[PDB]
Design an enzyme around this catalytic site. Structure first.
Site, PDB file in Angstrom:
ATOM      1  N   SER A 158       0.813  -1.246   0.000  1.00 29.39           N
ATOM      2  CA  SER A 158       0.000   0.000   0.000  1.00 29.39           C
ATOM      3  C   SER A 158       0.845   1.295   0.000  1.00 29.39           C
ATOM      4  O   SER A 158       0.249   2.366  -0.007  1.00 29.39           O
ATOM      5  CB  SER A 158      -1.011  -0.049   1.130  1.00 29.39           C
ATOM      6  OG  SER A 158      -1.897  -1.151   1.023  1.00 29.39           O
ATOM      7  N   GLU A 198      -5.116  -3.926  -6.634  1.00 27.01           N
ATOM      8  CA  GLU A 198      -5.502  -4.573  -5.395  1.00 27.01           C
ATOM      9  C   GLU A 198      -6.526  -5.652  -5.704  1.00 27.01           C
ATOM     10  O   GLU A 198      -7.434  -5.440  -6.512  1.00 27.01           O
ATOM     11  CB  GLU A 198      -6.132  -3.525  -4.489  1.00 27.01           C
ATOM     12  CG  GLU A 198      -5.211  -2.377  -4.116  1.00 27.01           C
ATOM     13  CD  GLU A 198      -4.270  -2.718  -2.987  1.00 27.01           C
ATOM     14  OE1 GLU A 198      -4.044  -3.919  -2.702  1.00 27.01           O
ATOM     15  OE2 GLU A 198      -3.746  -1.768  -2.378  1.00 27.01           O
TER      16      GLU A 198
END
Lengths: 254, 254
Positions: free
Chosen positions: B42, B129
């Protein structure tokens, strides 16, 4: 006496604690502030996924989501959103899942309607992420009760609210949750199975709702909710309060 | 001394650690495996938000996300997605922002191109993602280096990659991040300001990138990256490795 232990936890952690465990054949219900309202925070995401599963064929889980941004295909399926909503407490995923339910208020009304359909007449979802974690103490908006949410979770995991395949998907996502290791999970011995969904917010809010299975194979539903309004908006949530509360519950069910 | 301490951390945590801190007027650069590739995880969300801010007027942040199946308005704008992507590390938010930046299937190329525009010739984003956290060790896909990402973050927060108002938005979101308390933040004394973006993934991946300000007002950029490839897909990330590495760095900058 159990009540006295929960009161001591409240004193020690400078917190308000709510607990509900439904009765079973060999255990009495456990209830401590069980009908007091607490913020859902992310605990609503477990029933949210149930609602999406119930309202749609299993094929819907393969639908890749699209959106518009004029006051666009994504690589995200409803299933992936369900996984993120439960295992990572993804708020944007939950917002998309709420919208997928349809109806007014981004799906909040539809979600509340699904809870009503499960006989939960108490809980309400009014706002979405991030606001639903941020209502002041005393506001009824975006709240459930330990009692209410425990009986919803019981129907979803142990009852017949979902057909077996859908039920299995929800159970597995909850079983592989990554966020709850220091709450209910921490309070039960390792030979108990624990599946859960956490919730955290401001005003020291920390929740966990779980289905636990004893080594003897008996399932119990455990809802623990807490907040620390005395500390105001910035009060730190105390995960160890939930673990300790879970330990008291385990001591009674052993 | 310092290299020996990082090596010891690797031995103790059974991990591969990478560190880079740019030089300043009074401090030498710190570099340990600084040009080795590590998965972004992230961490890319900070530069992702910078990319969206760079390509759009601030009014774009007000654009609402409407979920479409054929229309259900969410309570979510591009701005809220930026906030979610950085402060809660929302993966779904990141995916929506990637779509906003490059369109369907084009976000990762657009993002990589943005990095190239900042003179980062090394980093690459290939998947979205959740896949970008899941590449096998040694796959160059979805990687940066401590060196590369530190110099990107430096330009974003301390340099003029962004005009002042956009720069302020990015800085504030990073300042209010909720996920990094046990990484770089844990290694610096409380009177130092720390703004950061974390990243976590499979193969024991744990990262943090930060800008820190001493009480005297001196900014430093700190990039710490780690993985545990030897443990396989399920290896546990070790936050305490990053905190310890950060403590070593802080001891040298104090």
């Amino acid at each position: 006496d159990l009540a006295d232990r929960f009161a001591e936890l409240e004193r020690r952690y400078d917190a308000r604690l709510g607990v509900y465990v439904p009765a079973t054949g060999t255990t009495a219900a456990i209830e401590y502030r069980a009908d007091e309202r607490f913020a859902f925070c992310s605990t609503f995401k477990a029933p949210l996924v149930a609602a999406v599963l119930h309202q749609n064929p299993l094929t819907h889980l393969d639908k890749l989501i699209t959106y518009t941004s004029d006051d666009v295909q994504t690589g995200m399926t409803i299933g992936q959103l369900c996984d993120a909503a439960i295992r990572y407490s993804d708020g944007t995923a939950a917002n998309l899942l709420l919208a997928d339910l349809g109806g007014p208020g981004g799906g909040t009304a539809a979600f509340t309607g699904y809870l009503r359909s499960l006989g939960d007449t108490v809980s309400r979802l009014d706002a979405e992420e991030p606001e639903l974690n941020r209502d002041p103490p005393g506001d009824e908006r975006d709240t459930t009760t330990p009692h209410a949410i425990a009986l919803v979770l019981q129907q979803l995991v142990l009852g017949n609210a979902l057909p077996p395949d859908k039920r299995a998907l929800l159970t597995d996502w909850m079983a592989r949750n990554t966020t709850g290791a220091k709450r209910i999970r921490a309070g039960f011995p390792a030979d108990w199975k624990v599946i859960d969904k956490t919730g955290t917010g401001d005003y020291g809010r920390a929740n966990d709702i779980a289905v636990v299975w004893s080594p003897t194979g008996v399932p119990y539903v455990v809802a623990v909710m807490s907040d620390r309004a005395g500390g105001g908006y910035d009060a730190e949530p105390r995960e160890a309060l939930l673990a300790e509360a879970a330990t008291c519950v385990a001591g009674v069910l052993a």
